[PDB]
Structure formats: C-alpha cells, structure tokens
Design a binder for this molecule. Structure first.
Ligand SMILES: *[C@@H]1O[C@H](CO)[C@@H](O[C@@H]2O[C@H](CO)[C@@H](O)[C@H](O)[C@H]2NC(C)=O)[C@H](O)[C@H]1NC(C)=O
Ligand SMILES: *[C@@H]1O[C@H](CO)[C@@H](O[C@@H]2O[C@H](CO)[C@@H](O)[C@H](O)[C@H]2NC(C)=O)[C@H](O)[C@H]1NC(C)=O
Ligand SMILES: *[C@@H]1O[C@H](CO)[C@@H](O[C@@H]2O[C@H](CO)[C@@H](O)[C@H](O)[C@H]2NC(C)=O)[C@H](O)[C@H]1NC(C)=O
Ligand SMILES: *[C@@H]1O[C@H](CO)[C@@H](O[C@@H]2O[C@H](CO)[C@@H](O)[C@H](O)[C@H]2NC(C)=O)[C@H](O)[C@H]1NC(C)=O
Ligand SMILES: *[C@@H]1O[C@H](CO)[C@@H](O[C@@H]2O[C@H](CO)[C@@H](O)[C@H](O)[C@H]2NC(C)=O)[C@H](O)[C@H]1NC(C)=O
Ligand SMILES: *[C@@H]1O[C@H](CO)[C@@H](O[C@@H]2O[C@H](CO)[C@@H](O)[C@H](O)[C@H]2NC(C)=O)[C@H](O)[C@H]1NC(C)=O
Ligand SMILES: *[C@@H]1O[C@H](CO)[C@@H](O[C@@H]2O[C@H](CO)[C@@H](O)[C@H](O)[C@H]2NC(C)=O)[C@H](O)[C@H]1NC(C)=O
Ligand SMILES: *[C@@H]1O[C@H](CO)[C@@H](O[C@@H]2O[C@H](CO)[C@@H](O)[C@H](O)[C@H]2NC(C)=O)[C@H](O)[C@H]1NC(C)=O
Ligand SMILES: *[C@@H]1O[C@H](CO)[C@@H](O[C@@H]2O[C@H](CO)[C@@H](O)[C@H](O)[C@H]2NC(C)=O)[C@H](O)[C@H]1NC(C)=O
Ligand SMILES: *[C@@H]1O[C@H](CO)[C@@H](O)[C@H](O)[C@H]1NC(C)=O
Ligand SMILES: *[C@@H]1O[C@H](CO)[C@@H](O)[C@H](O)[C@H]1NC(C)=O
Ligand SMILES: *[C@@H]1O[C@H](CO)[C@@H](O)[C@H](O)[C@H]1NC(C)=O
Lengths: 85, 220, 198, 50, 149
C-alpha cells in the first residue's frame, strides 16, 4: 500500500465501507481479514431533465440522537503535596 | 500617514423617502477554509537517542514521557481524519450530473470535474492544487485527494440537479431555472423577476465564475 | 458504542490522572523515587541534589499535565458552547439551519441529561415516496403569465395543478393561488393551460 | 564522518573541492568516496511504525 | 552529558507537541466552521447575514483544496437604486390600507405597491393590501384611491 506493507490481509477488488482505517484509501475489515479501497457511498444518478420534478407524496417522522459533552471531572492537584508530600 | 477607514457616505435620510433597487448583480465570492494538517508522527526514543542503548537506558529513568508525546500526536493524527470526514463526507450517495448540460443557460464547466484530466478535478480545483506548493514520519491522509474531489463532485451534482432536497432526504430532481427561482423566493424576490431575466442572470453568473477563475489565476 | 463521545472524555481524564500518578514512581535520574528513602539515607548536601532532581522531574510532569488539561478544557468549553447553542436554537425554537438540529427538515428537539453531557433527540421531517411530474415555470392564459404564489405547477400527464413544494397536494390552478406578471412572450418554457376563476 | 545509511549511486555532480553534501535540515545526504572520486547518496535506513 | 542532551531534546519535543496541540485545536475550530458552512451554505440556503458571502445568499459550491475547502458563494447584490416617495399606509373610504408583502412607493404623481428588494410597480388593489383601522391613528398616512377588481 501507499501507507506501507500490509502482511496478513487478503487484498480484494471489491469496495466496502471503511471498518478499520489503514490509510491512503485503504481500509481493513473482518469477514479472515481483508483489505480494500473504500467505497465512498452508494451510487445514485439523479434523473435530471429540464421539465420534470419529483414531489414527495409521504413523510417519515425521524428522531435522531446527538450526544454532546458539557463538562469534565473537576480535578484539583495540590502541587506542593504532589511534588513533595 | 494616519490611515483612513472608508469613504464617507452620507445616506440621504428623510422621513418619507425610500430607495428601491431596479437591478441586480449575481456576485460570486471565494472563501478559503483550512480543514486538516499534515499528520506527523515522532518516534520519541529515536529522536532523543537514535540507536544508542545507553541513552535509552537513561531515558527510561524519566518514565512515560515518550508514551504521552506519541499518544498526543496520535490524537492529533486521528483528529485530522475526523475533521476531513466531518467536512466532506456529508452525503452517503455519490451523485452524478446528467451527460447533457442543459441547465437553462447556466454554465458549470469551471466547477464540474473535467473528464479529460486523469485526476478528475474541476479546472478551478486543478488551479487550486497547482497554486499550493530522526524518528519523523508523515502518515498519509485517510481520504486521498481523488476521493475528496469525488465528494465535492457528488455535492455539486446534488446541489445542481436536486436543490437542497438531497441534504434533507432523498434527492428530488428539479430544473435549475426553478431551483434558482426558489432561491430567489428565499431571499424575498418574486419568481417572475427570475423568469423574465433568466438570460441576464445566467450571463452574469457565467461572467462571475470566469472572473473567479481569473482572479485565482492572477493573485499569488 | 453509542455513548462514545462522553466515554472518550472520561477515559482521557482518567488516563491523564493515571499517568500523573504513575510519574511519581520515576526517579528522574536520582537514586530513588521515594522522598522518605532519600531523606532517611542521605545527608542534606547530597539529598539536596537528589531532591532537586526529583523536584524538577515532578514539576515538568505536573506542568505537562496542566498543559493538556487546559487544552482539553478549551475543547470541552467549545463543545459546551455548541451544546448551549443547540439547546437555544433546537429545543427553545425551530431552526432553519440545515443539519444543525438533525438530518432532515427540523421540527423540534428534546433535551436529555447524560453523565457529563447532553443528548438531543431531534424530531425531523423526512420526505418520502416521491413521484415524477411534468413541471412548468408559468401558465399562459389570456395572453398573461401566471406564477404560483407559494407552490409549483405540476402535471400528471393530461391535467395541470398547483401544489405545495414539500408534499403532493394537487389543487386547481385558480387566480387565488396564482399571480399575474407580464405576457407569455418572455418566460422560457411557459405552457398553455386554462386558469379557473371562482 | 561516521553514520548509518544505505549508500547508493548519486546523480549530484560535486565541484572538485567539495566532499560532503547536506540538505535543508543540515543532514549529510551526499558524500564523495575518497578512494574513487564518485558521489554517493546516503539514504536513511528504512525504519517505520509497526 | 547524555542526561543534559536528553533533557534538552525532551524539552524541545514537549514544546513541539504543545504548539502542535494548540494548532490542532485551531484547525479543529476552522474545520467545524467549514462543516457548518458545508451544511448551511451548500446543502441549503442560509438567512444568516455574511455567513455565506457578502449580499443576499443564493447558493454555494464546494471545491477541494490542498488541506482545505473553497466555497464559491453565489449571492444577490441589489444595484441601480432609485428614490421614491413612500408612505406607511393608504387612506381610502375612511380605512387604512397596508401592503401585504411590499411597500407603497410614489414616482411623484401616482402611488404603487412594489416588492421590497426589486422595483416592480403594481396598481394598489385590495388583493395586495389589507385593511386595519381608520386613518386617524397612523402617522403619515396619505390619501389615494384603492382599486377593486
Ligand atoms: C422519474 O423518471 C425517471 C426517468 O424515466 C426515472 O429514472 C430512471 O429510473 C430507473 C429505475 O431506477 C432507472 O433504471 C433509469 O436509469 C432512470 N433514468 C435516468 C435517466 O436516470 C426515475 O426513477 C423516475 N422517478 C420516480 C420517482 O418514478
Ligand atoms: C405513508 O406512509 C405510511 C408509513 O408510515 C403509510 O402508513 C402505513 O399504511 C399501511 C397500509 O395501510 C399500513 O399497513 C401501515 O401499518 C401504515 N403504517 C403506519 C405507521 O401507520 C401510509 O399509508 C402512507 N400513505 C400513502 C398515501 O402512501
Ligand atoms: C435621492 O435624493 C437625495 C436627495 O436629493 C440624493 O442625495 C444627494 O445626492 C447628490 C448627488 O451627488 C449629492 O450632491 C447630495 O449631497 C446628496 N444629499 C445627501 C443628503 O446625501 C440622492 O443621491 C438621491 N438618490 C438617487 C438614487 O438618485
Ligand atoms: C441591469 O444591469 C444589467 C447588467 O448588470 C444590464 O444588462 C446590460 O444591458 C446593456 C444595455 O442593454 C448591455 O450593453 C450589456 O451588455 C448588458 N449586460 C449584460 C451582463 O448582459 C441591464 O440592461 C440592466 N437593466 C436595467 C433595467 O437597468
Ligand atoms: C461553458 O463555458 C465553457 C468555458 O467557459 C465553454 O467552453 C469554451 O468553448 C469555447 C467555444 O467552443 C472554446 O473556444 C473554449 O476553449 C472553451 N473553454 C473551455 C475551458 O473548454 C462552453 O462553450 C460553455 N457552454 C457550454 C454549454 O458548455
Ligand atoms: C390526472 O389527474 C386528473 C384529476 O384527478 C385526472 O382526471 C380525472 O380522470 C378520471 C379518470 O377517468 C375521471 O373519472 C375524472 O373525472 C377526471 N377528473 C377531471 C377533473 O377531469 C386525469 O385523468 C389524470 N391523468 C392521468 C394521465 O392520470
Ligand atoms: C399557446 O397559445 C398561444 C396563443 O394562442 C400560441 O401562440 C400562437 O401560435 C400560433 C402558431 O404559431 C400563431 O399563429 C399565433 O400568432 C400565436 N399567438 C400568440 C399570441 O403568440 C402558442 O403557439 C400556443 N402554444 C402551444 C404549445 O400550444
Ligand atoms: C409615474 O408613473 C405613472 C404610471 O406609469 C405615469 O403615468 C403615465 O405617464 C405617461 C407619460 O405621460 C402616460 O403616457 C401614461 O398614460 C401615464 N399612465 C397613467 C396610468 O396615467 C406618471 O406620469 C409618472 N409620473 C412621473 C412624475 O414620472
Ligand atoms: C385626506 O382626506 C381626508 C378625508 O377625506 C381629509 O380630512 C378632511 O380634512 C378637511 C380639511 O381639514 C376637513 O374639513 C374634513 O373634516 C376632514 N375629514 C375627515 C374625515 O377627517 C384630509 O385632509 C385629506 N388629506 C390630504 C392630504 O388631502
Ligand atoms: C427542454 O429541452 C428541450 C430540448 O431537449 C426543449 O425542446 C424544451 O423546450 C426545453 N424545455 C424547457 C422548459 O426549457
Ligand atoms: C587512488 O587509488 C585508486 C585505486 O583504484 C585509483 O583508481 C586512483 O587513481 C587513485 N587516486 C585518486 C586521486 O583517487
Ligand atoms: C416629515 O417631517 C416633516 C417636517 O420636517 C413633516 O412636515 C412631515 O409631515 C413628516 N412626514 C411624516 C410621514 O412623518
């Protein structure tokens, strides 16, 4: 690879999502351990034309989670006691 | 000299007069934002000591300083890849433009990828890539420049062919002079203004895109 | 691995504390890492040198620990400012900002407390089951161009309707949901259809 | 001048009074053999992360 | 002597790692800003002033750059403005009329209603105005006819 030499992984020609990052577009996964060039996303060609539109006829109420840290553990270190006791 | 802030512009205020615009300029401006750095890793033991075993035996008296330095650099190195992942990988569908570039007079050739180039970059992106010139190792980035260009190509194809619909769900196709009219209504200008003056807006947009390429090619 | 962002902060802080505690076991070139052993073994002229080596090693370790603690404090402060912005704009209001309050068109949000963190349940609207229609920018009628007030002209193949943009709800093209601007000679792609008058 | 490295053939044409070669970072990357006047590049031995 | 070299090189390496951590925090802040601009200017139309260029933001286009992103912000700039005499309301039949979406303008003799960001004069009708109260309350109300279709 461009990241280096990889020993113990079977290189395949298929593209999957990245499970374990190797680098330079190389990722590894377990299925034995395989190494591959990652696939960015599912391919989708939008049917564009100059007089056609797509209008939704239904909807999904989707609830998603977002986790954000707020604070840490308040730690205090007595510098004189840490250095000297 | 004592510097001058700006030209004085006494606005003609009165209690019963208004100024209404009769025309418009489609203006394209550049904004450059750094995303990641070079991922550097330092062998602390080899940097301090090299291959001297007596130096490493004396370095073991200082404890786990080298482990902390390596772990901090590893955190920075994975943070750069996380930054690139958060910036560019905002879509899980790789969109392509149609082969016929009939967008109602709007030209995107300077921002769409060039098929003649092996790097599959846009002319603007190609100019941008041309304008940028002991225990130490440089880790390669997880996303190559070709895949970052592919992500930007997918984003461009989505925002050209599908509007803002691909960012909120499935990509719903819409003609570009209609997408533009929707954007006009988002800033409070009626659709008719866009439709009546669509040739002038397309010409202004193409001229501004060309001026962007000329200004990038002419400013060091 | 759902709660990995809070657990990452907890693990980093605990690992920094463990490293700072572990650094007391290093002698930093002195004869021993225990201060009582040096003070009970040596006279003060050489115990001063050994204690000085221990002091400069432990002071370097403590200054390093305080340096990454301040850097992590800056990172946590930035994350908390972001969380306060999300609490103000997604929970206390409805946000027009795309992907600031979840994927899709944001409807509302719920805050939930978490150990050293906050979890936002973003309730969003996702369009689904889209359908093709033939569309036009304007309707030509009586030599006049008609444009939708809020919707979009669609056609199922034979008949023209006007609908809202994010949901298919076809309605008869009338003068009440359209407005007139100019003739039919200017707009590119204008089609001929009748406009009903109530 | 001592060190550890891989000594390969060099395309750098030294002037006859010059003996060693340095890069930007002041590391000896080129040298002249004293026995036979030929120029050798000194590539560092290929260490890496495991 | 090796201990002196070790403590000097360790101090140098700690200094390098500390300034690299500070620059990593700065680059992370810039990348969070870039992801926000990617979400709000490219994937949608933003109402935030000067967040996606100077002027009224229409759209934006992303371009890859070496260790960076370049946003081409396509914006709408008003131009060729013209003076008009304006009024807050129109007094007609003892009723005050206010614009539904636009603004009352006058070129000197005749009164029209137009949208705020572009000059498009239209006849003041009951379809683009609404009635609230009489003419005795609003300061600066002027007398003009209101056409009925
Ligand atoms: C709208 O019509 C277009 C064109 O007829 C459809 O696009 C085709 O979809 C089929 C099924 O996946 C593909 O095999 C074709 O290759 C597509 N054509 C193009 C040009 O991309 C589209 O699926 C239709 N949309 C809906 C919602 O029915
Ligand atoms: C819109 O999609 C919803 C899915 O949430 C559809 O509701 C389903 O309808 C089927 C058919 O009657 C039922 O078997 C399911 O139980 C329904 N699901 C729910 C959650 O109620 C709805 O019918 C769709 N509407 C249209 C017009 O397509
Ligand atoms: C609107 O009318 C005002 C007032 O007559 C104009 O303001 C003056 O413009 C002249 C032209 O150079 C200046 O010499 C004056 O100093 C301006 N007066 C003030 C108070 O600034 C204004 O230019 C007119 N606007 C347009 C678009 O014609
Ligand atoms: C609005 O401004 C545009 C340009 O910003 C004007 O278009 C120009 O019109 C002149 C004369 O008709 C031409 O010589 C130029 O070539 C046009 N420019 C472009 C870019 O097409 C337009 O006429 C202006 N409209 C009004 C009402 O002032
Ligand atoms: C879109 O713009 C591109 C670039 O400005 C146009 O391509 C130019 O076409 C002319 C005429 O054939 C050539 O002389 C130039 O060399 C082309 N430039 C480049 C960069 O290839 C193109 O004609 C415009 N229109 C369309 C529909 O693509
Ligand atoms: C498009 O929709 C219109 C309105 O729903 C359809 O018109 C109806 O067609 C049915 C089927 O014969 C008739 O029973 C109704 O009386 C029609 N309504 C009107 C107002 O004429 C039209 O057929 C649809 N077109 C297609 C191609 O499906
Ligand atoms: C839509 O209706 C307009 C108006 O009736 C049509 O325009 C006419 O086209 C014929 C045929 O070329 C001319 O002889 C007339 O002089 C045109 N009239 C006007 C006012 O322009 C137009 O062709 C119709 N379009 C379609 C698609 O049916
Ligand atoms: C203000 O605008 C009105 C409407 O455009 C002008 O009225 C027109 O004036 C022209 C020129 O004399 C006539 O040919 C039209 O018949 C008038 N229309 C109407 C409805 O009366 C008016 O003259 C303008 N006033 C100024 C001072 O410019
Ligand atoms: C606008 O019209 C109103 C009513 O048509 C005018 O108010 C009248 O003013 C006269 C003169 O002062 C009084 O004699 C009437 O009693 C008033 N009527 C009412 C109902 O108050 C007003 O003066 C007009 N304004 C302008 C500028 O013409
Ligand atoms: C769409 O393009 C076709 C050519 O393929 C043309 O005949 C038609 O008029 C165009 N329609 C619009 C609305 O531009
Ligand atoms: C040194 O000895 C080598 C041995 O082959 C010979 O080729 C060369 O001519 C001598 N002189 C110099 C200046 O190298
Ligand atoms: C504006 O002020 C003038 C005095 O300078 C006054 O005569 C006029 O009535 C005022 N108009 C409005 C609309 O307040």
């Amino acid at each position: 690879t461009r990241a280096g030499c990889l020993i113990g992984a079977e290189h395949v020609n298929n593209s999957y999502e990245c499970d374990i990052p190797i680098g330079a577009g190389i990722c590894a996964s377990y299925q034995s351990i395989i190494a591959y060039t990652m696939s960015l996303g599912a391919e989708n060609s939008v049917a564009y034309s100059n007089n056609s539109i797509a209008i939704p006829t239904n909807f999904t109420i989707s609830v998603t989670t977002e986790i954000l840290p707020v604070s840490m553990t308040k730690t205090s270190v007595d510098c004189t006691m840490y250095i000297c006791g | 000299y004592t510097m001058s802030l700006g030209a004085e512009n006494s606005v003609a205020y009165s209690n019963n007069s208004i100024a209404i615009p009769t025309n418009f300029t489609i203006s394209v401006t550049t904004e450059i934002l750094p995303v990641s750095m070079t991922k550097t890793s330092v062998d602390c033991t080899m940097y301090i000591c090299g291959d001297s075993t007596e130096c490493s035996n004396l370095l073991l008296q200082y404890g786990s300083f080298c482990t902390q330095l390596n772990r901090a650099l590893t955190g920075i190195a994975v943070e750069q890849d996380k930054n690139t992942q958060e910036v560019f990988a905002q879509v899980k569908q790789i969109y392509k433009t149609p082969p016929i570039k009939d967008f109602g007079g709007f030209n995107f050739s300077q921002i769409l990828p060039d098929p003649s180039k092996p790097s599959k970059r846009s002319p603007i992106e190609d100019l941008l890539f041309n304008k940028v010139t002991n225990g130490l190792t440089v880790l390669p980035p997880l996303l190559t420049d070709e895949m970052i260009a592919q992500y930007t190509s997918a984003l461009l194809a989505g925002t050209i062919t599908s509007g803002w619909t691909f960012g909120a769900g499935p990509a719903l196709q819409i003609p570009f002079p209609m997408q533009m009219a929707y954007r006009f209504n988002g800033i409070g200008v009626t659709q008719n203004v866009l439709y009546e003056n669509q040739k002038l807006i397309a010409n202004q947009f193409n001229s501004a895109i060309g001026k962007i390429q000329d200004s990038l090619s002419s400013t060091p | 691995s759902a709660l990995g962002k809070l657990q990452d902060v907890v693990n980093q802080n605990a690992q920094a504390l463990n490293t700072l505690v572990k650094q007391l076991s290093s002698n930093f070139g002195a004869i021993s890492s225990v201060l009582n052993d040096i003070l009970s073994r040596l006279d003060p002229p050489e115990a001063e040198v050994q204690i000085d080596r221990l002091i400069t090693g432990r002071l370097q370790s403590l200054q390093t620990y305080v340096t990454q603690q301040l850097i992590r404090a800056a990172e946590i402060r930035a994350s908390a400012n972001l969380a306060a912005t999300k609490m103000s704009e997604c929970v206390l209001g409805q946000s027009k900002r795309v992907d600031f309050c979840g994927k899709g068109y944001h409807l509302m949000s719920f805050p939930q407390s978490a150990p050293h963190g906050v979890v936002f349940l973003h309730v969003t609207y996702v369009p689904a089951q889209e359908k093709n229609f033939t569309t036009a920018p304007a309707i030509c009628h009586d030599g006049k161009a008609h444009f939708p007030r809020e919707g979009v002209f669609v056609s199922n193949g034979t008949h023209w309707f006007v609908t809202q943009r994010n949901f298919y709800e076809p309605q008869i093209i009338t003068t009440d949901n359209t407005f007139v601007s100019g003739n039919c000679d200017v707009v590119i792609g204008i089609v001929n259809n009748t406009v009903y008058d109530p | 001048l001592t060190g550890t490295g891989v000594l390969t053939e060099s395309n750098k044409k030294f002037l006859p009074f010059q003996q060693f070669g340095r890069d930007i970072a002041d590391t000896t990357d080129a040298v002249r053999d004293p026995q036979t006047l030929e120029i050798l590049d000194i590539t560092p031995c290929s260490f890496g992360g495991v």
